[PDB]
Design a protein around this ligand. Structure first.
Ligand SMILES: *[C@@H]1O[C@H](CO)[C@@H](O[C@@H]2O[C@H](CO)[C@@H](O)[C@H](O)[C@H]2NC(C)=O)[C@H](O)[C@H]1NC(C)=O
Ligand SMILES: *[C@@H]1O[C@H](CO)[C@@H](O[C@@H]2O[C@H](CO)[C@@H](O)[C@H](O)[C@H]2NC(C)=O)[C@H](O)[C@H]1NC(C)=O
Ligand SMILES: *[C@@H]1O[C@H](CO)[C@@H](O)[C@H](O)[C@H]1NC(C)=O
Ligand SMILES: *[C@@H]1O[C@H](CO)[C@@H](O)[C@H](O)[C@H]1NC(C)=O
Ligand SMILES: *[C@@H]1O[C@H](CO)[C@@H](O)[C@H](O)[C@H]1NC(C)=O
Ligand SMILES: *[C@@H]1O[C@H](CO)[C@@H](O)[C@H](O)[C@H]1NC(C)=O
Ligand SMILES: *[C@@H]1O[C@H](CO)[C@@H](O)[C@H](O)[C@H]1NC(C)=O
Ligand SMILES: *[C@@H]1O[C@H](CO)[C@@H](O)[C@H](O)[C@H]1NC(C)=O
Lengths: 236, 46, 48
C-alpha cells in the first residue's frame, strides 16, 4: 500500500564542499612505498556537494545518477536504510533495490511499481514486483554521530560499491579531511541507471546526507610501507 | 615445495624461476599478489 | 548445432529476438521491455 506524507516542508538543499573526500582503491595489487599516477572517474577536490536533512521534513527527491555517485551519511540513529536505482522507476523497466534491515542487506533486480513516495516505517515502497532476474542476501552495510561513505559506479554491466565507515564527533557537518574508500561489492545487474531515490525511516530522528558527482580526472596516489593509500593530488 | 634452490614454481597458474623465503607482509582479503618498483611479482600467498 | 532438440515438425516459435530499438546496447546490458516502437511521428499510445 502507498500513502502520501502530507505535512512536510518543501525540500531545499544546502551546500558545502567535499574537501579531499572520496578516493577509492583502483587495483587489487599490493604496492608499498610507491607513488602512482592514475586516470579515471574521481570526485573532484573541493567540489560542490548537495546537502539534505531528515529531521517533520523528509527529503527523498529524484536525483540524476550521471556517471557515479559519492554518497555520505552522518547518522546516530540509522535513519537512512537503502536506495533504488533505475530510469523510469515504473514497471516498464528494470530497477535495482538495496535495502538494509536490522540484520542483513537485500538486493533485488526486478520490475517494481514504486509508490509515489517511498519510505520505510512495514515496507511501504512498492505495490508489486515481477520478473526478478537477480537476488542477493549478505550482511548489513550499516551494521554520537557516525559517518558512512559510499561510491556507486555503474560500469560494463556491473554495479560497483566502495564503502568506508568512521565514528566522528557531534558536528554533523561533513568533516574536512582525507578518506580512502575500499572495495565492497560488484553486483552483475546489466541495467540502465540514470536516476535514484533514498529510503528514509520515519518514526523524526536527525540524520543528514550529502551527494556528490564523479568527473573524469587524473589523480596522483601515494602508498605507504603497509600498503594503504594515505595521500592524493588532483592534477587539474 | 622444494625450498632454497633455483626451481620453477608455478604458483596458481603463475610460472617462473626463483627462490622462496618467508615474509612478514600483510595482505588485505582481496589481494594475493604483490609487485615492486620494477613491477615484477615478489610476494605470493601460499 | 541443436537441430534435434530445438526443432518441432510443426515448427518451434518459442525463441524470440528484438528487431527495433532507439539506440545500440552497451556491453553486457539486457533489455526485456515490450513497449511499442514508434517508427515516425504521431505517437502510438499502444495502438499497434
Ligand atoms: C515476466 O513475468 C510475467 C508474469 O510472471 C511473464 O508472463 C507469463 O509468462 C508465462 C510463460 O510465457 C505465461 O504462461 C503466463 O501466462 C504469462 N503471464 C502473463 C500475465 O502474461 C513474462 O513472460 C515474464 N517475462 C520474462 C521475460 O520472463
Ligand atoms: C538509458 O536510458 C536513457 C533514458 O531512457 C536513454 O536515453 C534516451 O535515448 C534515446 C535514443 O537517442 C533518446 O531519444 C532519448 O531522448 C534519451 N532519453 C533522455 C532522457 O535523454 C539511453 O539511450 C539508455 N541507454 C542505452 C544504452 O540504451
Ligand atoms: C499521492 O499523490 C499523487 C498525486 O500527487 C497521486 O497520484 C497518488 O495516487 C497519491 N497516493 C496515494 C493516494 O496513495
Ligand atoms: C570548502 O569549505 C570549507 C568550509 O567547510 C571552506 O573553509 C573552504 O574555503 C571551501 N573551499 C572552497 C574551495 O570553496
Ligand atoms: C554549488 O551550486 C549551487 C547551485 O549552482 C550554488 O548556489 C553554490 O554557490 C555552489 N557552491 C559553491 C561553493 O560554489
Ligand atoms: C504496470 O503499470 C501499469 C501502469 O503504468 C499498471 O496499469 C499495470 O497494472 C502494471 N502491471 C503490473 C503487473 O503491476
Ligand atoms: C532481515 O533480513 C534477513 C535476510 O537475511 C531475514 O532473514 C530476516 O528475517 C529479516 N528481518 C530481521 C528482523 O532480521
Ligand atoms: C604499519 O602497521 C604497524 C602495525 O602493524 C604500525 O606500527 C606502523 O606504524 C604502520 N606503518 C606506518 C607507516 O604507519
Amino acid at each position: 500500500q502507498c500513502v502520501n506524507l502530507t505535512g512536510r516542508a518543501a525540500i531545499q538543499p544546502s551546500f558545502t564542499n567535499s574537501s579531499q573526500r572520496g578516493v577509492y582503491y583502483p587495483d587489487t595489487i599490493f604496492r608499498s612505498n610507491t607513488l602512482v599516477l592514475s586516470q579515471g572517474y574521481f570526485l573532484p577536490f573541493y567540489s560542490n556537494v548537495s546537502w539534505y536533512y531528515a529531521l517533520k521534513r523528509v527529503d527523498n527527491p529524484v536525483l540524476d545518477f550521471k556517471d557515479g555517485i559519492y554518497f555520505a551519511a552522518t547518522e546516530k540513529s540509522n535513519i537512512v536504510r537503502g536506495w533504488i536505482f533505475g530510469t523510469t522507476l515504473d514497471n516498464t523497466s528494470q530497477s535495482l533495490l538495496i535495502v538494509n534491515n536490522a540484520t542483513n542487506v537485500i538486493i533485488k533486480v526486478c520490475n517494481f511499481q514504486f509508490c509515489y513516495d517511498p519510505y520505510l516505517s512495514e515496507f511501504a515502497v512498492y505495490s508489486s514486483y515481477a520478473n526478478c532476474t537477480f537476488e542477493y542476501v549478505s550482511k548489513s552495510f550499516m551494521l554520537f554521530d557516525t559517518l558512512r561513505e559510499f561510491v556507486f559506479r555503474n560500469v560494463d554491466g556491473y554495479f560497483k560499491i566502495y564503502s568506508k565507515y568512521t565514528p566522528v564527533n557531534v558536528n554533523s557537518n561533513l568533516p574536512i579531511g582525507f578518506s580512502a574508500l575500499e572495495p565492497l561489492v560488484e553486483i552483475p545487474a546489466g541495467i540502465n541507471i540514470t536516476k535514484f531515490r533514498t529510503l528514509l525511516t520515519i518514526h523524526v530522528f536527525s540524520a543528514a546526507y550529502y551527494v556528490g558527482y564523479l568527473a573524469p580526472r587524473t589523480f596522483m596516489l601515494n602508498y605507504n610501507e603497509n600498503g594503504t593509500i594515505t595521500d592524493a593530488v588532483d592534477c587539474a | 615445495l622444494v625450498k632454497n634452490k633455483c626451481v620453477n614454481f608455478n604458483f596458481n597458474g603463475l610460472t617462473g624461476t626463483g627462490v622462496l623465503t618467508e615474509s612478514s607482509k600483510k595482505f588485505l582479503p582481496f589481494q594475493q599478489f604483490g609487485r615492486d618498483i620494477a613491477d615484477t611479482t615478489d610476494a605470493v600467498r601460499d | 548445432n541443436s537441430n534435434n532438440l530445438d526443432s518441432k515438425v510443426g515448427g518451434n516459435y518459442n525463441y524470440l529476438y528484438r528487431l527495433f530499438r532507439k539506440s545500440n546496447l552497451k556491453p553486457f546490458e539486457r533489455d526485456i521491455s515490450t513497449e511499442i516502437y514508434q517508427a515516425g511521428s504521431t505517437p502510438c499510445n499502444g495502438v499497434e
